[PDB]
Scaffold this active site. Structure first.
Site, PDB file in Angstrom:
ATOM      1  CG  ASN A  48      17.056  14.894  12.719  1.00 54.08           C
ATOM      2  OD1 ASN A  48      16.252  15.114  11.812  1.00 54.08           O
ATOM      3  ND2 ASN A  48      17.236  15.738  13.703  1.00 54.08           N
ATOM      4  CG  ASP A 104       0.043  -3.999   2.778  1.00 52.14           C
ATOM      5  OD1 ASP A 104       0.556  -3.483   1.734  1.00 52.14           O
ATOM      6  OD2 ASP A 104      -0.249  -3.309   3.798  1.00 52.14           O
ATOM      7  CD  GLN A 143      -1.454   9.594   8.226  1.00 49.92           C
ATOM      8  OE1 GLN A 143      -2.032  10.107   9.182  1.00 49.92           O
ATOM      9  NE2 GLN A 143      -1.458  10.137   7.010  1.00 49.92           N
ATOM     10  N   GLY A 144       2.571   6.688   8.743  1.00 55.82           N
ATOM     11  CA  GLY A 144       3.964   7.040   8.482  1.00 55.82           C
ATOM     12  C   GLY A 144       4.921   5.928   8.910  1.00 55.82           C
ATOM     13  CD  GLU A 169      18.051   9.977   6.932  1.00 55.17           C
ATOM     14  OE1 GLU A 169      18.580  10.477   7.968  1.00 55.17           O
ATOM     15  OE2 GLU A 169      17.812  10.650   5.899  1.00 55.17           O
ATOM     16  CG  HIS A 217      -0.580   0.384   2.437  1.00 55.74           C
ATOM     17  ND1 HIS A 217      -0.131  -0.546   3.356  1.00 55.74           N
ATOM     18  CD2 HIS A 217      -0.471   1.595   3.031  1.00 55.74           C
ATOM     19  CE1 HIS A 217       0.216   0.081   4.466  1.00 55.74           C
ATOM     20  NE2 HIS A 217       0.016   1.378   4.294  1.00 55.74           N
ATOM     21  CD  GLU A 230      22.473  11.422   7.069  1.00 56.03           C
ATOM     22  OE1 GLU A 230      23.675  11.637   6.761  1.00 56.03           O
ATOM     23  OE2 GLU A 230      21.937  12.049   7.996  1.00 56.03           O
ATOM     24  CG  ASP A 239      -1.215   0.670  17.151  1.00 54.67           C
ATOM     25  OD1 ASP A 239      -0.517  -0.267  16.602  1.00 54.67           O
ATOM     26  OD2 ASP A 239      -2.430   0.930  16.806  1.00 54.67           O
ATOM     27  CB  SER A 240       2.856   0.793  14.237  1.00 51.46           C
ATOM     28  OG  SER A 240       1.842  -0.164  13.975  1.00 51.46           O
ATOM     29  CB  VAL A 300      19.596  17.097  10.675  1.00 50.28           C
ATOM     30  CG1 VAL A 300      21.038  17.612  10.791  1.00 50.28           C
ATOM     31  CG2 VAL A 300      18.641  18.109  11.312  1.00 50.28           C
ATOM     32  CB  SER A 304       2.580   2.085   6.253  1.00 55.24           C
ATOM     33  OG  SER A 304       1.322   2.132   6.858  1.00 55.24           O
ATOM     34  N   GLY A 305       4.960  -0.106   6.408  1.00 57.72           N
ATOM     35  CA  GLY A 305       6.007  -0.743   5.702  1.00 57.72           C
ATOM     36  C   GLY A 305       7.241  -1.036   6.475  1.00 57.72           C
TER      37      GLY A 305
HETATM   38 CA   LIG Z   1      19.651  12.436   8.546  1.00 56.63          CA
END
Ligand SMILES: [Ca+2]
Length: 223
Positions: free
Chosen positions: A54, A84, A174-175, A52, A40, A62, A171-172, A57, A177-178
């Protein structure tokens, strides 16, 4: 993640951010060239951001790498969220060390009561909206088959499990997901769906990764 805690820099080294000019979803690095996420979350023009902490920044560590292929499971159903899962091939291999590392795929299903780590950069509030800069983590148990079906009558397939807390507040969201659900060093789940976040009697619902291990390996080998 609602009710979680700050992980600390690069303590979840398999965690990725999927980015399209903003962070939209999580994922899990499973070898130097491939990431697993939720179907999804599919869209074109994905940049995968490894290492990653932060997300707003540039700190060092990264690696930003374009997706070259995104393969949604052919039986994914966007109304039920059955199957899914999606696989993303990176344009170039990531460079793996202690801060960027892959997570192993399971070799059996995890039981009810097993403690798992769920992580991501999603919303940290149950009512309003607040998005963190740094990666948040939550420890949650896998729930029984029957409690999961009591929570979501008619909606839980054999390719899903519930984890979390029936009393609310953790809970987990929105954002997230996956993103990964890891138990004993294995990737057992993928953050998929739930009713609100962190509501009483409504735990999170996760894609059951052990059902897809053979599919994942064949799809990688063919692509
Ligand atoms: Ca960063």
């Amino acid at each position: 993640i609602v009710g979680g805690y700050t992980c600390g820099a690069n303590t979840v080294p398999y965690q990725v951010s999927l980015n399209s000019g903003y962070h939209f979803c999580g994922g899990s690095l499973i070898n130097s060239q491939w990431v697993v996420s939720a179907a999804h979350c599919y869209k074109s023009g994905i940049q995968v951001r490894l290492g990653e902490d932060n997300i707003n920044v540039v700190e060092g560590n990264e690696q930003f790498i374009s997706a070259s292929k995104s393969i949604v499971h052919p039986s994914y159903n966007s109304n039920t969220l059955n199957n899914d899962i999606m696989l993303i091939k990176l344009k170039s291999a990531a460079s793996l060390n202690s801060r960027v590392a892959s997570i192993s795929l399971p070799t059996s299903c995890a039981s009810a009561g097993t403690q798992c780590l769920i992580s991501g950069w999603g919303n940290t509030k149950s009512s309003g909206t607040s998005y963190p800069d740094v990666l948040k983590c939550l420890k949650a148990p896998i729930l029984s088959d029957s409690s999961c079906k009591s929570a979501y009558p008619g909606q839980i397939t054999s390719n899903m499990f519930c984890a979390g807390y029936l009393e609310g507040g953790k809970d987990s969201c929105q954002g997230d997901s996956g993103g990964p659900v890891v138990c004993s060093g294995k990737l057992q789940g993928i953050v998929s769906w739930g009713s609100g976040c962190a509501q009483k009697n409504k735990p999170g619902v996760y894609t059951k990764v052990c059902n897809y291990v053979s599919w994942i390996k064949q799809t990688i080998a063919s692509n």
